[PDB]
């Protein structure tokens, strides 16, 4: 009570680079949320129903390093800024949110879980404003119901003068819409 989270680092800088080049990652994967990195950027992926979902503005068209080699995206939708890869073995897959609660939580890359009030299909307000610097690198992180089901993934921050009052996210309905058209 309530939802809590913690992070575990699995890779160093040099291992990251090499894995980027071979596309081979033999590590045990675990957790609901993966911490991801490219040469220039870090961000998050949320595993929902066997797909690891993240933002296009983080991952572009890239493969994900995997045990059998690089994994090709099974879903790429650029205009909604959503991509997904079939979830590697061991990723804990979450449940889409049904009930419709407007009381949400955003899980950041620092594994903080922060209260968000849903204001619309794709938007929610931070109950406490945070500096933009604190949210950076959290795109792809989950927005959750109090029960722990996923309502969407973090896309962009609404901010002024380095302070974010609200967040824009990709609703889990956009994901199945992609799983429809694709």
């Amino acid at each position: 009570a309530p939802i809590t989270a913690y992070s575990q680092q699995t890779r160093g800088l040099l291992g990251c680079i090499i894995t980027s080049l071979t596309g081979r990652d033999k590590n045990q994967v675990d957790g609901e949320v993966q911490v991801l990195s490219t040469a220039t950027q870090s961000f998050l992926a949320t595993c929902v129903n066997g797909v690891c979902w993240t933002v296009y503005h983080g991952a572009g068209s890239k493969t994900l390093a995997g045990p059998k080699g690089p994994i090709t995206q099974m879903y790429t939708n650029v205009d909604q800024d959503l991509v997904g890869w079939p979830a590697p073995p061991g990723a804990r897959s979450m449940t889409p949110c049904t009930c419709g609660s407007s009381d949400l939580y955003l899980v950041t890359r620092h594994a903080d879980v922060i209260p968000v009030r849903r204001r619309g299909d794709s938007r929610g307000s931070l109950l406490s404003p945070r500096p933009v610097s604190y949210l950076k690198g959290s795109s792809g992180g989950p927005l959750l119901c109090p029960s722990g089901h996923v309502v969407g993934i973090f896309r962009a921050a609404v901010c002024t003068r380095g302070v974010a009052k609200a967040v824009d996210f990709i609703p889990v309905e956009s994901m199945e819409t992609t799983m429809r058209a694709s």
């Binding site: 992070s7 080049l21 957790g31 490219t38």
Partner: peptide, 13 residues
């Protein structure tokens, strides 16, 4: 041009 790489994970309770 490299792959995206999982460098960590977050465990939810």
């Amino acid at each position: 041009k490299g792959s995206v790489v999982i460098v960590g994970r977050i465990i939810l309770s």
